[PDB]
Each structure stands twice: as structure tokens, then as C-alpha cells.
Design a protein around this nucleic acid. Structure first.
Ligand SMILES: [K+]
Ligand SMILES: [K+]
Ligand SMILES: [K+]
Ligand SMILES: [K+]
Ligand SMILES: [K+]
Ligand SMILES: [K+]
Ligand SMILES: [K+]
Ligand SMILES: [K+]
Ligand SMILES: [K+]
Ligand SMILES: [K+]
Ligand SMILES: [K+]
Ligand SMILES: [K+]
Ligand SMILES: [K+]
Ligand SMILES: [K+]
Ligand SMILES: [K+]
Ligand SMILES: [K+]
Ligand SMILES: [K+]
Ligand SMILES: [Mg+2]
Ligand SMILES: [Mg+2]
Ligand SMILES: [Mg+2]
Ligand SMILES: [Mg+2]
Ligand SMILES: [Mg+2]
Ligand SMILES: [Mg+2]
Ligand SMILES: [Mg+2]
Ligand SMILES: [Mg+2]
Ligand SMILES: [Mg+2]
Ligand SMILES: [Mg+2]
Ligand SMILES: [Mg+2]
Ligand SMILES: [Mg+2]
Ligand SMILES: [Mg+2]
Ligand SMILES: [Mg+2]
Ligand SMILES: [Mg+2]
Ligand SMILES: [Mg+2]
Ligand SMILES: [Mg+2]
Ligand SMILES: [Mg+2]
Ligand SMILES: [Mg+2]
Ligand SMILES: [Zn+2]
Lengths: 98, 129, 141, 217, 83, 149
RNA sequence: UUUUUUUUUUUU
RNA sequence: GGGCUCGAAGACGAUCAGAUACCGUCCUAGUCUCAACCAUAAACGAUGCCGACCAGGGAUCGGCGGAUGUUGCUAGGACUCCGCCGGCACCUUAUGAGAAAUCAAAGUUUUUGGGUUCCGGGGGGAGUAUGGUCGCAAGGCUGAAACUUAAAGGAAUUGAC
RNA sequence: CUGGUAAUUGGAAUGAGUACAAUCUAAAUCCCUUAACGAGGAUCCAUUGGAGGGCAAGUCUGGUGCCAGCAGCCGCGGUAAUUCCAGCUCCAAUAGCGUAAUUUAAGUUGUUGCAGUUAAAAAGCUCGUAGUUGGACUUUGGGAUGUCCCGUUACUUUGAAGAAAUUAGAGUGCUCAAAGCAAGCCUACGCUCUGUAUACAUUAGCAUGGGAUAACAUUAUAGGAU
């Protein structure tokens, strides 16, 4: 039985899509199928922000940010709980969680 | 490609009548199509139809009464003798009380009852009821 | 879709002719292999009893089905034939003359007996049915 | 005794409505079997066609329930089908009889050729479909009899059809689908527009409008 | 349907959709019948006088019942002098 | 659809219902034929002549004023080319593709397109042989195709 | 994200 | 010819009852390119091509027509709005189909017929034997039978896990 | 009064058999006819398959105990067997019934009329010759009354001809019937001219009317028509 209309990927009007390597296990996975997340977080964790600011060597300074694009295979994405198994009706929802 | 213009016309009329449309468009036109439509109109299965001139094959707009259950083409156009009409009607028509098979005989395009009356055979074009 | 040309009768006939071979019943009766089978297209065949053999019944049943190894006289082929009815194997002896019929499923095994397609009808010119009911007696010689 | 809970039931109990054709004309739903019992009850006959067990798996074994198939008809153009599932066979049969009464439909009968006497066959070629089972009825000449399997033959006999040709495709051993396809084929008899129906419809007051004053209390 | 003698033979004559001409069957519970009352010169309803329209379930399920009924009523009002 | 692709475009000309010349047009049929013959002598194909006439001289359709097609007029004056224009252009395209392939052996796409173009050439040449627009001995050969043009 | 092998034949 | 990386085979270190593995370490062929072969993939939309009809809606790519107001710009370009054609798709819906899952084509089919190619006929034996043909080889294409067997199998429901 | 049962009683009927005789027959035999015999447990004794379901008929009794065996298929038998071996009873057909290539059912060979997403299944993709298929367009109408006015084929209509036997079918009391082609009135030294009809028959060939739908060939370097 077929469970997804898109077959678990995002390929339309296309023959082949080159793969990426899973950021967790290194497994090959088509890019249109890999679960991709973009993480933008402060280099200094919120706990240490005050201590680092108190030790600033300049009158003013804005702490940088860390940018990471994570590309997971299906297995790692499920195991890491990046995505979860949804009900038959709920897995047709494509909007990101609020 | 387009192989049977009569088939396209009849299929358009059938689909439109099923949908409930009051009018349908037939393109391209043909004299076989016109004769078929005249046979249908003679028996009250369609209203007035109008031929539109465009310096090409033409176009027809047909009024639909709502009495047409199904009109269809028969392909290939098999040879039908005066003795095979009974079998063809049994195969194609819902009942012996109503329904017509359109044939093309050397005497012209006509329904099967007239063909029986004149004792003329020919080739089967289609059916309607 | 199907071909429908008025001048396409040859193609339809040829396609049906080619596709008939996919039918197992048609192929069985048109390949000419019935003549290489033990009966060679006959309802019955006579043979000589070589040995009595017991065949275990198939799961889920448990029994010893009594059969005889018979060599057909007309071609020398060896087959296994079931001996029906209670204690009817006692009417069979080695080197006896037996008439063999099909098992009813046209060359296929029947019931819980594996790989047996034949049965014994007569022994020494006397039907097994008569022997079972004591209507007749097996000839002494 | 019987206390009608619907306007149609009240009218039928008050003798305002006297024929099932009056209800059929306006396509009004029938939700009480006492209506059918009062109208065509005396001439109706019933017959249990099949008792089918069904089982639901549970933590502590299989829960068995029985499916009752019942056919009712007057042999004169009315037939109904009823399916009911219950723990007990008797309860299922009673429910199936009630449902078959509630589902009685009119059956149109026509002539094969010459139109002398009462109709004897189906007016036209009709086809019914339930599941994978498809039943086709073809008009037959007088004296041809009912050429059908026992289930369709019984359904046709309860409908009063004298002779017809039939053909079936699919899993006809699914008795429920077979009988339902036959029933659908019979229902489709009155939906086919023939030239004899080309006359303009002349509408009549609905029972709820004709007897509105009586139902106002 | 009639016999050779001329006797009515059908159990009943079913109604037909005012817009599609389809036969309205006994189990068609989506079909409706509507009466549009007539008005006199003073805009008062005349009891017992109205135009009847019947719609089959097929057209109503399609959503085309509204426009079809509007057109039919417009034509019938033009014919019946109801303005 | 397209003969040698999956394109389904419907872009085309829409000839007006009126077959007569516009009132503002004043040129005469013999004049139009004279200009057509002059253009053909200058080395213009019928398509080019029609495009030039429409874009410059206000002649939307030559048949409207002359009563005949451009190629018919050219033939009547002994100016029609030995091989038809469309077949000529197809052969020119084939020659160009083969010349490109001579230096690009790894260009397999060009090989595919050459196969398609030569199939078109052969089908068109067969049609023109049926209608006697080419001599029966005519044959397209890749080796000496460049000579034909 | 350490490691976790196996359950005679028929029948209920 | 190249040979960074990774890495069949192989060798070690672990884990384990064993561990010819999963994990770790080092590595040959290979991975790259040229010339010549090979012609097979869940080579998939598991869904031939051409043509007609057939509900609605919002997005998006290319081209074009019209309108309109801005731009740290040079009539144009960017953006806004309304349309036509063509394309990859999506959402809703059944008056359709279907064994259903689902499908706006898998619709217009017992009310069966637009043209045309291929191709299946219970499960195994078997894509095997044999013959032919192609290939350096690996193998490709074409392709049986004897015999065996009552199911194998598809979709969906409840429970158990 | 109305029905059913009884190896209880009572007389009647009759052919299987037997046999004078006649008849039959080339001669015999058989059949038909018929003197004298020929029936009460009317011993003048009906069988073949079955009794869980498909599928009509036992939750009867004894034996065996996954044995022996049955069972076309599904399944029966392991110590309370409607399924085996038996008794009784019952069911189907019946002088017949059981068992071991081919048709139907099979729309499971599908032209009528099947399938190819997941059940078996659309070649990885495109080109392409044979084959199959192929858009529209050329004389309509009225007046009147079948009749008057403005190149080659497919196809269809009609006709001839196309052995019997077989098939369908008309007539006909071989006692009926399968049959056969007989036969019927009346006893006339005869008659019904007694009957022994009629239909069907793919394709291909022969002749004929039609000219819608189709196929092939032709068109303009005028070397054309007159
Ligand atoms: K898939
Ligand atoms: K994904
Ligand atoms: K066993
Ligand atoms: K057993
Ligand atoms: K193409
Ligand atoms: K274009
Ligand atoms: K067992
Ligand atoms: K390397
Ligand atoms: K390695
Ligand atoms: K272990
Ligand atoms: K290879
Ligand atoms: K796929
Ligand atoms: K678009
Ligand atoms: K049975
Ligand atoms: K015991
Ligand atoms: K016992
Ligand atoms: K039994
Ligand atoms: Mg799954
Ligand atoms: Mg791919
Ligand atoms: Mg092509
Ligand atoms: Mg197009
Ligand atoms: Mg173990
Ligand atoms: Mg390394
Ligand atoms: Mg390589
Ligand atoms: Mg492959
Ligand atoms: Mg755009
Ligand atoms: Mg198979
Ligand atoms: Mg029974
Ligand atoms: Mg016992
Ligand atoms: Mg017994
Ligand atoms: Mg099949
Ligand atoms: Mg599979
Ligand atoms: Mg498959
Ligand atoms: Mg494939
Ligand atoms: Mg090929
Ligand atoms: Mg044509
Ligand atoms: Zn991973």
C-alpha cells in the first residue's frame, strides 16, 4: 500500500536529485527527502551571557550568533525526535509547528 | 489524433446532457454529424441546433432537451444487412419499444426502423436513446 | 487498448493464437505430452505388482496409506497405485496382475496421499470391489 | 397499540394516505414499519435468505454476532430488502424483517414486444452493482421464465416479475452483495427516462401540504 | 405506459426535475418541491395560487439548484404576469 | 502535439474571417506579383517574401489581392526553387549538426538531434516524392548533403 | 543508541 | 593517465557463547579522466503514446496583452493589479470510478466500440534446462518441460504484540 | 363420511414362463394371435450409490481409538466418531446406477466481451520500416405529379444455381413412443390425378438495383476539352 502521495520526498518534474550526508550518522539521503533544520542560536548560552558581558573588554559589543544547517536522514530524525510519527490525517499537515 | 469527429460530437453531447447543460458545442462540424443530429431531432431527442461558419470545418451549438439517455458511436463501422438489424438492436438498444441505431445506406443516413421499411442495408454509424 | 481496425482481423487472430498458450488447459491438450506419460492417454492400464509400500499421510492427518508399486506392461513404466478399502492390500501379492485407473483428479494427487495419482481397480481379473464384498474369489492360480 | 411519531405515520393512521404510491410520488422517507403494515401488510410475504455469522476479535476471544438477510414482497411490483446484525438469531431476523418492510420500493414492469395484458418483464435493460457483484437484467419474451440464480430468482419472484434474462459478474458467492446488487437493479427500473415519460409533469400538493391543517394539531 | 386497449398500466407517474428533466425516484430524499405564491395588483398573496417547481437531488447536490430555480421562476413570472 | 518532442503549444496565426483586401490598400494584383518576383530574384523564400510584404507594404495576405499563394505565383514565372524551402532548411540544419559533430565526438545530444532531424528530412522527402515535387531518383545522403546547398 | 539466542506434532 | 578522500577484498582491535558482522583502526581493487566494452536498476508515477469532453480554487515557472503607482536606478528594468497560452505541482469536492487504499484522471464502461504498440492468465519448478544470438569476461536477449501443490496473493477491520 | 398402515382375512386380474395350433420365414427363429397350464412372504424375493456442508437423507445403536480406514474439495478418526467398520432407519435415481477425453459453467482466451498503480502484468528512453489507423470540403430545394424542370474496388439489395442422408418442419393412431413413409373411404373385380410438402445453407464465384460511408488512382511546365 502507498502511504504518502509524494512518496516521502519532494521530487516533481525531475529525474535525479543528488544526496546529502546525514549530519548525525553520515548516511546518504536525497536532499529533497532529508529533514532539514536551520539552527540560529547565540554562541554564549543564556546562562553564561551575564558573565561574558561583565568580562567584556570593550565599552560595547554584540555577541555573535551560531548558524548551523542540520540535514537528517529519516532514521536519525525520528530517533532524535526531530520529527515524530503522526496519525494518518495529521501527517498531511505541512505547516511548521507554531 | 482526431480520428472520428462524429465520436467527439456524440461524446460531448452525452457528457453535457449528463451534466445537465442546456447547450453543447461541437467542433469540427461535418455533414455526417449534421445528418446524425437531424435524425436525432426528428425523434424529439434534441432541440434546435445552429451551424456556425468560420471559413473552416465549422461549429455547431445544440440545444439539449434532457431526453437523451445516451448517444454513442460504433467503431469500426461494421457492415449491417437488413437481416442483421435485429441482432444489432438486441445488442445495442435497451428495449424494443424505443431507441434507434443510425446506419449509412446507399439511400442515405437513417435510423434502423426506416432501413427496415425500405429494405436497405449499409454500415452502422451509432446509436442514441 | 485493443486493436479495432476493420482491416486488423489478422492481428486479432494472431494475438489470440499466441495468447492461447498461456492457458494451462489449452497447453496440456495441445503440446502432445500426454503420450509420454505412464498411461499414454488411456483411461486404464494393466501392470505387474512389484512391491507393497506404505505411504505416510500428509499433515494434519496421521496414517499409513497402503499402495503398490506397479510396472505397466505396455511401456514398462513404474508408478505408485493406491489400494482402497479396509484390508484390501491382503488381496494383492507380488507379481500379481492389476488393472490401474486414474485417481479422479486427472494426473494429480488426491486427499492426504502425497505423490500418488493412480488406484487399483482389479487384481488377477477380479474387481477389488467384488473381493471386498466377498461377491467373487481371487483365482488361486 | 401504535403511536405514530411522524407526520406520515399520523396521516397513515388517520386514513388520510391510503396507497403507497402517494408516498412514492413525493419521495418522502418512511421511518415506521407500521405504515407499510397498514398499507400493503396483508399482501406482503417475508423470507429469510441467509443467516451469516460474523466475529469480532477481543482480548478474551471472539465475539460472534449473526447477520440476517430478509426479503419482503407482494409479488405485484413491491419488494424490500433488510439486513440486521444482532447477538441472537431471532432478534436479527426480527430487525431484518422490520428493515425490509421499511425499504419496500416500487418496481416498474414493462413489455418485451406487443403490449397486451399485464406487464411481465423489466421495461428496459437495467444493471445493479454492490461491491464487486454486478447484476444485469435483460427483457425477455413471454414464456421465457426467470433465468437467474436462486437468490436473484427469489428477489425477482417477490417483485412479481414473470420472465427476465440475467447475468452476473464478480463474487456472487458474497450473498449480501448479490442480493443488494439485485435490489439496486430492481430500484433502477423507475429511474430510466423513456419516451412515454416525456410528458410534462403536473405537480400535486404534497401530503404535508394537503393535510397541513390536520397535522397542525 | 399503456396497454394495447389503452389502460394505464404503470404503478404511478414519477415527477421530473424542473431543471434537468431527470426522473425523481422514490428514495431520492434530496429532492424538493417548492411553491411560489402569486400576488395580486395590491401585492397580496392569493391563497391557493402558486407555481410549483421540483428539483432532484442531483442538481441540488451540485449547487446549481439556486440559479436554475431563479431562471425558471423568472420565465414563469414573465409568462404569468407576476410583477 | 509536436512530432519529435512532448511540446503541446498551440501558438499559431488567426486568419481573419474577411478574405477581401482592406479598403485602404490600393496596390494591384499584377503589381504584387511583380514585387514577389523581384524579391524571389533577389534570393528570398516565399516565407520571407510574405513576412516582408506584411511588415512593410501592408499586404496582410497575398492571396487576398492576387488570388493565389506566393509559391504558385513563383512557379507560374519559373522562379520556384528546385527543392522546397522547408526541406532545404531541414537539410541545412542537418548539415550544420553534422559539421558540429565532426569536431565533437562526445556530444551525444547532437547525435540524438541529428537522428531526429534526418528522420524529419526523410519523411518530408518521401512526401515530396509522392507529390512529384522531387525527381524519383532524388535521395538524401549525409556524405554529400552539403553540395545540395 | 553497550548487551537481549531459542520455544516438537494435531486440536481446542 | 591520475590516484586527495572514502573504501569492496584483506589484515588487526573490540563486542559476543561464537561474531567470518554490526562499532573502531590500516588498507588493495575501485572511487576521477581518456579510448574501447558492458546494456542492466524499486532504470518508479511500480500508472504506453496521440486525440476529444469533463468541477471549483489559490499558488508558482516561461512567454505575451492591458492598466496603474512608486523606484538613492538607467523608454526600459524591479514591484502592484487584471487577463491569454504553455509547464512542474498542490488544495477542496463526487454528480464519477474503484475490492478498497485511493484517483480530477486510475472519470466519461454490462447504457460495454476514438486510433494505435506492448503485455498477464492460480502458486512453484524458473527466468531454471536446452538451442540460438551478443559480449574479452561478468553476463545480456530469446526461453521450455517433467514434476509438485490448495492455496499463494491484494485492500481494509478488530484484537494481540 | 373421509384418508394412511398391517408376512390378518377374502376372493378377482394379469404377464414373465410354458405349449397344442396357426401365423411369420427362402427354410427356420423372434414378434403379433391363441387352446391347456402358470402368483400370497404373489421366494415370480431390484439394484446402484449415498445420509457433516457443497447436496436429499440420523446430534440412533455396537466396534475401533490419528490405528484401520474414509474423504472429487472443505475435512473426519487421539476411548461418548451424524464422516471409518457394521446393524437399523432414511435419501436420490431406478432396470438402471457407480468409477476412470472432451463441452458448458468460462466475461478463467474476452471480436461481441477480460486484465496490466498496489492481486499476474506498460519494453529504461527515443527514432523507425512493414502492419493498422487517419480532420473538413464538391447537388440542396420547391413546383408539381414511379414521372418532368433547373477510372478501379470495397459495401448493401435482389435473382439464379447450389446431392442425398442428417437438422428444422407439414401430413399420417407402426396399440403409444423412438420410428417409418406411410396411408385413407368402401368393400366398389375400385376410388383418393392418394401423399411422399416446405425451409435452412459461412466464404468464394455468376447476374441485378443503390451511390450514403469508405479505399486505391488522377489533377496545373495545358502536351486540356470542343
Ligand atoms: K510508490
Ligand atoms: K522528508
Ligand atoms: K502427517
Ligand atoms: K486428522
Ligand atoms: K512527440
Ligand atoms: K509558435
Ligand atoms: K494429527
Ligand atoms: K587511491
Ligand atoms: K577494505
Ligand atoms: K550473544
Ligand atoms: K553491465
Ligand atoms: K518511486
Ligand atoms: K498557470
Ligand atoms: K455431501
Ligand atoms: K470404548
Ligand atoms: K465408542
Ligand atoms: K459424509
Ligand atoms: Mg507498510
Ligand atoms: Mg532515477
Ligand atoms: Mg510520432
Ligand atoms: Mg494541441
Ligand atoms: Mg537456536
Ligand atoms: Mg582512510
Ligand atoms: Mg568506473
Ligand atoms: Mg528490466
Ligand atoms: Mg509570468
Ligand atoms: Mg501461472
Ligand atoms: Mg441436506
Ligand atoms: Mg459409535
Ligand atoms: Mg453408517
Ligand atoms: Mg482474469
Ligand atoms: Mg509485490
Ligand atoms: Mg504485481
Ligand atoms: Mg517495469
Ligand atoms: Mg524492439
Ligand atoms: Mg473521414
Ligand atoms: Zn542519520
Amino acid at each position: 500500500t502507498f502511504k504518502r502521495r509524494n512518496g516521502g520526498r519532494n521530487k516533481h518534474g525531475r529525474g535525479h536529485t543528488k544526496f546529502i550526508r546525514c549530519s548525525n550518522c553520515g548516511k546518504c539521503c536525497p536532499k529533497d527527502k532529508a529533514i532539514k533544520r536551520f539552527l540560529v542560536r547565540n554562541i554564549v548560552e543564556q546562562a553564561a551571557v551575564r558573565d561574558v558581558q561583565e568580562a567584556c573588554a570593550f565599552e560595547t559589543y554584540t555577541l555573535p550568533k551560531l548558524y548551523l544547517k542540520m540535514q537528517y536522514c529519516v532514521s536519525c530524525a525520528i530517533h532524535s525526535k526531530v520529527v515524530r510519527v503522526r496519525s494518518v490525517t495529521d501527517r498531511r499537515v505541512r505547516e511548521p509547528p507554531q | 489524433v482526431r480520428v472520428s469527429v462524429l465520436n467527439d460530437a456524440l461524446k460531448s453531447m452525452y457528457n453535457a446532457e449528463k451534466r445537465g447543460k442546456r447547450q453543447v458545442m461541437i467542433r469540427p462540424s461535418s455533414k455526417v454529424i449534421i445528418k446524425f443530429l437531424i435524425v436525432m431531432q426528428k425523434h424529439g431527442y434534441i432541440g434546435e441546433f445552429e451551424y456556425v461558419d468560420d471559413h473552416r470545418s465549422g461549429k455547431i451549438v445544440v440545444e439539449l432537451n434532457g431526453r437523451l439517455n445516451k448517444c454513442g458511436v460504433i467503431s469500426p463501422r461494421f457492415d449491417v444487412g437488413v437481416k442483421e438489424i435485429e441482432g444489432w438492436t438486441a445488442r445495442l438498444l435497451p428495449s424494443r419499444q424505443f431507441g434507434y441505431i443510425v446506419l449509412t445506406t446507399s439511400a442515405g443516413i437513417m435510423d434502423h426502423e426506416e432501413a427496415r421499411r425500405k429494405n436497405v442495408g449499409g454500415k452502422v454509424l451509432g446509436f442514441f436513446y | 487498448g485493443k486493436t479495432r481496425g476493420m482491416g486488423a482481423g489478422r492481428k486479432l487472430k494472431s494475438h489470440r493464437r499466441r495468447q492461447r498458450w498461456a492457458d494451462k488447459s489449452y497447453k496440456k491438450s495441445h503440446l502432445g505430452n500426454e503420450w509420454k506419460k505412464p498411461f499414454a492417454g488411456s483411461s486404464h492400464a494393466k501392470g505387474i505388482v512389484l512391491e507393497k509400500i506404505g505411504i505416510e499421510a500428509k499433515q494434519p492427518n496421521s496414517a499409513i496409506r497402503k499402495c503398490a508399486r506397479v510396472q505397466l506392461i505396455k511401456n514398462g513404466k513404474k508408478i505408485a497405485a493406491f489400494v482402497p478399502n479396509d484390508g484390501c492390500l491382503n488381496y494383492i501379492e507380488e507379481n500379481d496382475e492389476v488393472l490401474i485407473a486414474g485417481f479422479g483428479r486427472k494426473g494429480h494427487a488426491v486427499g492426504d496421499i502425497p505423490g500418488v495419482r493412480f488406484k487399483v481397480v482389479k487384481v488377477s481379473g477380479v474387481s477389488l470391489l467384488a473381493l471386498f464384498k466377498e461377491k467373487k474369489e481371487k483365482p488361486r492360480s | 397499540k401504535w403511536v405514530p411519531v411522524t407526520k406520515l405515520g399520523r396521516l397513515v393512521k388517520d386514513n388520510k394516505i391510503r396507497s403507497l404510491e402517494q408516498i412514492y410520488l413525493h419521495s418522502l422517507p418512511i421511518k415506521e414499519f407500521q405504515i407499510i403494515d397498514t398499507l400493503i401488510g396483508p399482501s406482503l410475504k417475508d423470507e429469510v435468505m441467509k443467516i451469516m455469522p460474523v466475529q469480532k476479535q477481543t482480548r478474551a476471544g471472539q465475539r460472534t454476532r449473526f447477520k440476517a438477510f430478509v426479503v419482503v414482497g407482494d409479488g405485484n411490483g413491491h419488494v424490500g430488502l433488510g439486513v440486521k446484525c444482532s447477538k441472537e438469531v431471532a432478534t436479527a431476523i426480527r430487525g431484518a424483517i422490520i428493515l425490509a418492510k421499511l425499504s419496500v420500493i416500487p418496481v416498474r414492469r414493462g413489455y418485451w414486444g406487443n403490449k397486451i395484458g399485464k406487464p411481465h418483464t423489466v421495461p428496459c435493460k437495467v444493471t445493479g452493482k454492490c461491491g464487486s457483484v454486478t447484476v444485469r437484467m435483460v427483457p425477455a419474451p413471454r414464456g421465457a421464465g426467470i433465468v437467474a440464480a436462486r437468490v436473484p430468482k427469489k428477489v425477482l419472484q417477490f417483485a412479481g416479475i414473470e420472465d427476465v434474462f440475467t447475468s452476473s459478474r464478480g463474487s456472487t458467492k458474497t450473498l449480501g452483495n448479490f442480493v443488494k446488487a439485485t435490489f439496486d437493479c430492481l430500484m433502477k427500473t423507475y429511474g430510466f427516462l423513456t419516451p412515454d415519460f416525456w410528458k410534462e409533469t403536473r405537480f400535486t400538493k404534497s401530503p404535508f401540504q394537503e393535510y397541513a391543517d390536520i397535522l397542525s394539531k | 405506459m399503456q396497454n394495447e386497449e389503452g389502460q394505464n398500466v404503470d404503478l404511478y407517474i414519477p415527477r421530473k426535475c424542473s431543471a434537468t428533466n431527470r426522473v425523481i425516484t422514490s428514495k431520492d430524499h434530496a429532492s424538493v418541491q417548492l411553491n411560489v405564491g402569486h400576488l395580486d395588483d395590491k401585492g397580496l398573496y392569493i391563497p391557493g395560487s402558486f407555481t410549483t417547481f421540483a428539483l432532484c437531488g442531483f442538481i441540488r447536490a451540485q449547487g446549481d439548484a439556486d440559479s436554475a430555480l431563479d431562471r425558471l421562476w423568472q420565465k414563469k413570472k414573465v409568462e404569468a404576469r407576476q410583477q | 502535439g509536436r512530432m519529435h518532442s512532448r511540446g503541446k503549444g498551440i501558438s499559431a496565426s488567426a486568419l481573419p474571417y474577411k478574405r477581401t483586401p482592406p479598403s485602404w490598400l490600393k496596390i494591384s494584383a499584377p503589381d504584387v506579383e511583380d514585387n514577389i518576383c523581384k524579391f524571389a530574384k533577389k534570393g528570398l523564400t516565399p516565407s520571407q517574401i510574405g513576412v516582408i510584404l506584411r511588415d512593410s507594404h501592408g499586404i496582410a495576405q497575398v492571396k487576398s489581392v492576387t488570388g493565389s499563394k506566393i509559391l504558385r505565383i513563383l512557379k507560374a514565372h519559373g522562379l520556384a526553387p528546385e527543392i522546397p524551402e522547408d526541406l532545404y532548411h531541414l537539410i541545412k540544419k542537418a548539415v550544420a549538426i553534422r559539421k558540429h559533430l565532426e569536431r565533437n565526438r562526445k556530444d551525444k545530444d547532437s547525435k540524438f538531434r541529428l537522428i531526429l532531424v534526418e528522420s524529419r528530412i526523410h519523411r518530408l522527402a518521401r512526401y515530396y516524392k509522392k507529390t512529384k515535387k522531387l525527381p524519383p531518383v532524388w535521395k538524401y545522403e549525409s556524405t554529400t548533403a552539403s553540395t545540395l546547398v
